[PDB]
Design a protein around this ligand. Sequence first.
Ligand code: BEF
Ligand code: BEF
Ligand SMILES: [Zn+2]
Ligand SMILES: [Zn+2]
Ligand SMILES: [Zn+2]
Lengths: 513, 513
Amino acid sequence: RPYTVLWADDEIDLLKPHILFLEQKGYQVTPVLSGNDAIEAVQNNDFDIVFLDENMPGIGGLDALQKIKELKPYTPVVMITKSEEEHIMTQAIGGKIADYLIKPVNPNQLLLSLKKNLQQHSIISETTNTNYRQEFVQLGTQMSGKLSFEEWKELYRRIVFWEIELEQADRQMGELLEMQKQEANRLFARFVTQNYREWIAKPDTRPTMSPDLFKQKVFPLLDNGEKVFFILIDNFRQDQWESVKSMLSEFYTFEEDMYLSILPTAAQYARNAIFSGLMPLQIEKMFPDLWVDEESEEGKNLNEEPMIRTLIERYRKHYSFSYNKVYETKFGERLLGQIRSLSQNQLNVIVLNFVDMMSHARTDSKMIRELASNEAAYRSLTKSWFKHSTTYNLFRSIAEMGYKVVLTTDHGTIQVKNPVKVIGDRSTNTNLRYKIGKNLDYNPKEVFEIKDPASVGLPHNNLSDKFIFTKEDDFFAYPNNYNYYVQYYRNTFQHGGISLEEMLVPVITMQPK
Amino acid sequence: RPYTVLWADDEIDLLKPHILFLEQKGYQVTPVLSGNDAIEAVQNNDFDIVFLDENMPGIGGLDALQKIKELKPYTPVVMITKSEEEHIMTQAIGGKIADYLIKPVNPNQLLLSLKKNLQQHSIISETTNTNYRQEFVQLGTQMSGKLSFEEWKELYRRIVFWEIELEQADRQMGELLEMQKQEANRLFARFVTQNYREWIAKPDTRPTMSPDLFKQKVFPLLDNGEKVFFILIDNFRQDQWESVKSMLSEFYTFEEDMYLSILPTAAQYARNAIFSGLMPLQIEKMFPDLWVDEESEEGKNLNEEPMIRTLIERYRKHYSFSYNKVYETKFGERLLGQIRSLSQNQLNVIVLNFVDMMSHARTDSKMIRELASNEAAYRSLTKSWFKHSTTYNLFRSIAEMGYKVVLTTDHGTIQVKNPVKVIGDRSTNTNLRYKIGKNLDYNPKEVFEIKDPASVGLPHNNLSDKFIFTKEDDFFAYPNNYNYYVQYYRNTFQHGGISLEEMLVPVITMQPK
Ligand code: BEF
Ligand code: BEF
Ligand SMILES: [Zn+2]
Ligand SMILES: [Zn+2]
Ligand SMILES: [Zn+2]
């Protein structure tokens, strides 16, 4: 079927050359001479696009626009007029005009406007597929050759970008990236297993990790006299920052970067390392009060504010600061009300936990299994919360206050696929991406064995304790009810292990506009 | 602040007057001679917009665009070239260009695209605010007089339209419509309580209601030899339809309409009326084995496929039909996978329950309390579900199967606000918007008294039973721990009573494009 065009213009006869040209290109043009005729035509038909002229007898062009957008809000309306007035242009833009063309009109301009407003989705789709197939060989070739951390960053940023651009494409085109994604995870998995021990041993030569975050990305700005809001959104992947960055460009300049999470990828160690500036083991030694062991019943991140103080004082700084933790809407509302009473501190730290709460609810919540069945839904559901929670307005006010913002997280999360059999003490931790214990049977290769936790800067309730970690998208399953739990945990989001999603996380330094 | 423009063209010299015109109108313009110089400037500067000439030395104009979008995807780009080729248009469109202007370009045309690509949201907001006040007058006029059912449809449609249209505006602009909506609900409740008993007694004259839906909206299509998918999304408000119809306009054209759900606005009564074509009392009188009374705890809508068979038979029809109920996520994926097999039926009934489950979860799920805290969030969450669940690809597949779709619901829901004291019994039901009881104590002025359930086509277990319904945003609250349950149920979504959201519900007839 060919596309239909409704063209309303009292001088429609002067446009015969254009109309023949359009009919020549396969379009079915319907002419009328008044806006009343135009509205009636829209009432009784389903045109694909409407060309309107501003100056007509009787009803005006912009009035027909308003009435037409009430009847067919999804049908693009192009305004084609002699007038160059600024109030006419403005009103048309406000009337939701799809495009505005000033007479005299190049016939080829009409052609462009018809392609862009009737086929931009189908066109963008075929280009994206083409441009992806173009870059496919480079991707596999880019990762094939062993590469540096800085290159690993760009490789992942690239895969994320493609993962988002291909949400709309067909399965076949989706799977080509999944393979590349998981193959990258496999290759990234072994990449960290080779160097993780030496990053702990050699802090000078290592990449930025959780204990260095405040030192590399926060202290420079504070020392430079800049006022900062450090926003920690627990469990915020790279692709979740891509999903929300468009909302924030309206208020901020982005200085995007990434850093490496320590293992395990969970708040107990990675987030405590961030605010303390130390590895968990050094937290237990130097500050035994502030560390909470794994076997304890109490929460494991209740002493982040005092840790911040030790970090500030340990570096001989005298920053004024504040700490707020929003784990419940109503608390985040009160914070949004008193936000501007924090204008005195050089550093305001806000922790948001809903995304981690939601990521976990993907397992034990019927609601979130549906609303985040897949990663695209997960990202969309993340966008909805960012917008309609206090978070959006929170950023808006901070931008008004002139505070720079370092937006980052403590770890990501990954959709788990394959079970890894493990058996341990009943008192063994219940995390599915890492386990702590002594009497643990498993296959050493299938996991990432750490028999000397002190070397990787991790404390232990005993001193025969060993750490094991899943890699890629694996997850631990116990032989009891193995058939059941593997069903229950397949395709859920789990953090604590090793993967590009979990470890490679964004740290965005944002300047208000 | 004045907006920054980056213009890249090898013949920049010639475009100088265009630049003075832009710079005259308060636009900072930065000119480069090639993409390479353009690609640099974007990294080293935060530009508001880019102007890309296609044909330049070395770097391809389109290949620069591809880079700029990957660096600063949030920044619009306008292409201004002498090219009139089709693929350059196509490639530029596929590169996510904002506007494409053929040389020679009118200066006012460059002004047009600058207003339309850097301010559009602000202009639309002002126009929306202005236009609503002008229409606010008429709406007040429409409500002033006595209203027919058809006028109630049109009024409610326009309230919802402005409800969504004003999501992007100040609070006070939202409180004007809120007052308008509340007044509309008050009159509509008055309108229902005056005429409801007449409607059940005069089928030939009453407006379309639940037991009439199939004969009025489905059978005429099948009689005309059309293939119909009847999709009932439980608990789907007008504003929820309004939120998704953009997604569907890509594949269907719509004949939008609304009908009245019978009371109570609950699946047990309204939805069974739909599929049986009878009032609940008639379902019990004629098909007692298919009716499930209130006392029992078994599901109340488990015999809808038999009811459809009796409806087809009752009207001496010979339709081939299927019936599928989706509440699990996995089952929906199975249905989509096998959607083609339903091509052997004239009528395909699909029931989707998630939106109702989701709506109820707004009460007892701290997840949905956050994700659907307000009506705007409720709509945003319905949109993401529709898109990223199997529902989107279900309508997609149905259109490709040349099937006509009748999308509707059994009732809406309303955010409750004010309690209405009621004394009942352990036997009394738990619905917040209506009660059934032999001995109910309440203030008759705060409810709609049905002492004669049979007169409104309702069954009951005891001869002295009666029905009472809340109106507007009221909800029933029992005296014991009244204070706790008032604050607990306040601001939740509840259905079963009288309101525009609950009763005046959409029925869309859709034709595949
Ligand atoms: F008469 Be139209 F506005 F060119
Ligand atoms: F040289 Be450009 F493509 F006008
Ligand atoms: Zn965390
Ligand atoms: Zn977590
Ligand atoms: Zn229902």
